[PDB]
C-alpha cells in the first residue's frame, strides 16, 4: 500500500481557513521524495525534522491540513506568529514537529469576476488554541446589547470573504497550504518511509 499524499496535494477543491480540512494518513508507506524534490512549491519549511531524512523515520500517524490563504498570510502559518489567520483561523503549536508546504493557486482558485468563496474569520472573542477549528457563524457581540441573530450596530458577522482576482498581487493572490504534522505516540508506528 501507499499513503494518499497526492489526494491531499492534488485535490480538486481546497478548504477555507476557518474550516480547514484534516486528513489522517496512517497504515501506509510514505514516499516524501515527490514533495521534497518537487519545484512547484513556493514555501517549504520543516520544523523539528529535515526533509531529506524524513524517508528514514517512522511515525504513529500523519496529519495533513489543507486550506487556502493569501500569500502575505503564509508567514502566519509558521509557529509563533500573530495574525488574523494565526489568531482566529489556524494556529500551529509552539512545539510543532512537521512541515508547511504552500504553492500559488491563482490559476486554480481565481476568477475574472473574482472568487469570494474562500473565507476567513475577522472577529473572535478569544484566540484559537493550537489545532482548534471554529465553524461558528454566530453574530459577534461588540456591545452589551444582544444581536438576537441579526447583524446590526455593534453586532457583526464573524466571517469575511477573500477577493481573489488574477491581476491581484502575489501576496493578494490565493495560495494553497498543506501542513504535515508527524505524530509519534506510544503505540505501533503505522506510517513509515521507504526505509
Amino acid at each position, epitope marked *: 500500500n501507499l499513503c494518499p499524499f497526492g489526494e491531499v496535494f492534488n485535490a480538486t477543491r481546497f478548504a477555507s481557513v476557518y474550516a480547514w480540512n484534516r486528513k489522517r494518513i496512517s497504515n501506509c508507506v510514505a514516499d516524501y521524495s515527490v514533495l*521534497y524534490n518537487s519545484a512547484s*512549491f513556493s514555501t*517549504f*519549511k*520543516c*520544523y523539528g*525534522v*529535515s*526533509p*531529506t*531524512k524524513l524517508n528514514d523515520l517512522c511515525f504513529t500517524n500523519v496529519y495533513a491540513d489543507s486550506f487556502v490563504i493569501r500569500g502575505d498570510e503564509v*508567514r*502566519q502559518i*509558521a*509557529p*509563533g*506568529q*500573530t*495574525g488574523k489567520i494565526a489568531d482566529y483561523n489556524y494556529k500551529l503549536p*509552539d*512545539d*510543532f514537529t512537521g512541515c508547511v508546504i504552500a504553492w500559488n493557486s491563482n490559476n486554480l482558485d481565481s476568477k475574472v469576476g473574482g472568487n469570494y468563496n474562500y473565507l476567513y474569520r475577522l472577529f473572535r472573542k478569544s*484566540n484559537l488554541k493550537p489545532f482548534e477549528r471554529d465553524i461558528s457563524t454566530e453574530i459577534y457581540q461588540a456591545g452589551s446589547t444582544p444581536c438576537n441573530g441579526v447583524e446590526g450596530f455593534n453586532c457583526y458577522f464573524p466571517l469575511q470573504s477573500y477577493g481573489f482576482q488574477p491581476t491581484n498581487g502575489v501576496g493578494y493572490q490565493p495560495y494553497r497550504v498543506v501542513v504535515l504534522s508527524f505524530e509519534l505516540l506510544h503505540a505501533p508506528a503505522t506510517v513509515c518511509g521507504p526505509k
Partner: antibody, heavy 128, light 109 residues
C-alpha cells in the same frame, strides 16, 4: 499577547557581580531559543549569549568569557544571566528576546529566523 | 557570516524608496534579520527570513537577499521611518549571532 519583562540590574561596582532575570508570558518557553542582547550608550547592538533547550545548547559572545552564565527555567518560563567580574565596557542596556524557531528548507539546509519579540530592557551601570 | 557590513548612513527624500545594504559571505544560507531602533526605544523586527515581514509592520517595509548582499527597502518613507537599522545573521561555524554596525535613516526636507 507576548510580553518579556526583564528584572534585576542596577548599580554594580567594578569587579562586581550581577544576576538578571527575564520573565515571559504568552508563549511556551522550551521550544523557542532565548537570547540576551546588550546595547551600550551611544553604541550599536551586541549579542551576549543564547540558550537552546533541546540539548541545553549554550553560545556566548567572545567578549564574555568565563564571567557570564546563561540559565533557563522552562517550567518558570524565565531566563537568567549571571554576570561576574564586570568592567565599564559591560555597562549597557540588556535586552532579553525570543528567537524564531529554526527550520530546515526543502534541500534540508537549516535556516534561523531572528528575534521576533524583544523586551523593554534593563540598564546595568558600572560605577564606583 | 561572522561579519555583516552596513552603510553608516543613508539619506532619503520624503516620498522616495530607501535601500539599506547588509553584506557578508554566504548570508543567504541562514537568513538576514533587520531591526529598526528609534531613540529611547527597544529594537523592533521589521523583516525576517530575508523577506518575511512581522505582523503590524507596514507593507512598505520589505527585504531581499541576493547572495552575499542583502537589502532592506522602504517603499515609501516617512518622518517616523527614521531610525537606526541593524541586520543580523547566525553562524553555525562559531555559534554566534552577528549584528551589523547600524544604518541611520535621515529623511531630508
Amino acid at each position: 499577547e507576548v510580553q518579556l519583562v526583564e528584572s534585576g540590574g542596577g548599580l554594580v561596582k567594578p569587579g562586581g557581580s550581577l544576576r538578571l532575570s527575564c520573565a515571559a508570558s504568552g508563549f511556551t518557553f522550551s521550544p523557542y531559543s532565548m537570547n540576551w542582547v546588550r546595547q551600550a550608550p551611544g553604541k550599536g547592538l551586541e549579542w551576549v549569549s543564547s540558550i537552546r533547550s533541546s540539548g541545553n545548547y549554550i553560545s556566548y559572545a567572545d567578549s564574555v568569557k568565563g564571567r557570564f552564565t546563561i540559565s533557563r527555567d522552562n517550567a518558570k518560563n524565565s531566563l537568567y544571566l549571571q554576570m561576574n567580574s564586570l568592567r565599564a565596557e559591560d555597562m549597557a542596556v540588556y535586552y532579553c528576546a525570543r528567537a524564531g524557531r529554526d527550520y530546515y528548507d526543502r534541500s534540508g539546509y537549516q535556516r534561523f529566523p531572528g528575534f521576533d519579540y524583544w523586551g523593554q530592557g534593563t540598564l546595568v551601570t558600572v560605577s564606583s | 557570516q561572522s561579519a555583516l557590513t552596513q552603510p553608516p548612513s543613508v539619506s532619503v527624500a520624503p516620498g522616495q524608496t530607501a535601500r539599506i545594504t547588509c553584506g557578508g559571505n554566504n548570508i543567504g544560507s541562514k537568513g538576514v534579520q533587520w531591526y529598526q531602533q528609534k531613540p529611547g526605544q527597544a529594537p523592533v523586527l521589521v523583516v525576517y527570513d530575508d523577506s518575511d515581514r512581522p505582523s503590524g509592520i507596514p507593507e512598505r517595509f520589505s527585504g531581499s537577499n541576493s547572495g552575499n548582499t542583502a537589502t532592506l527597502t522602504i517603499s515609501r518613507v516617512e518622518a517616523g521611518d527614521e531610525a537606526d537599522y541593524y541586520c543580523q545573521v547566525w553562524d553555525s561555524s562559531s555559534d554566534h549571532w552577528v549584528f551589523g554596525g547600524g544604518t541611520k535613516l535621515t529623511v531630508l526636507g
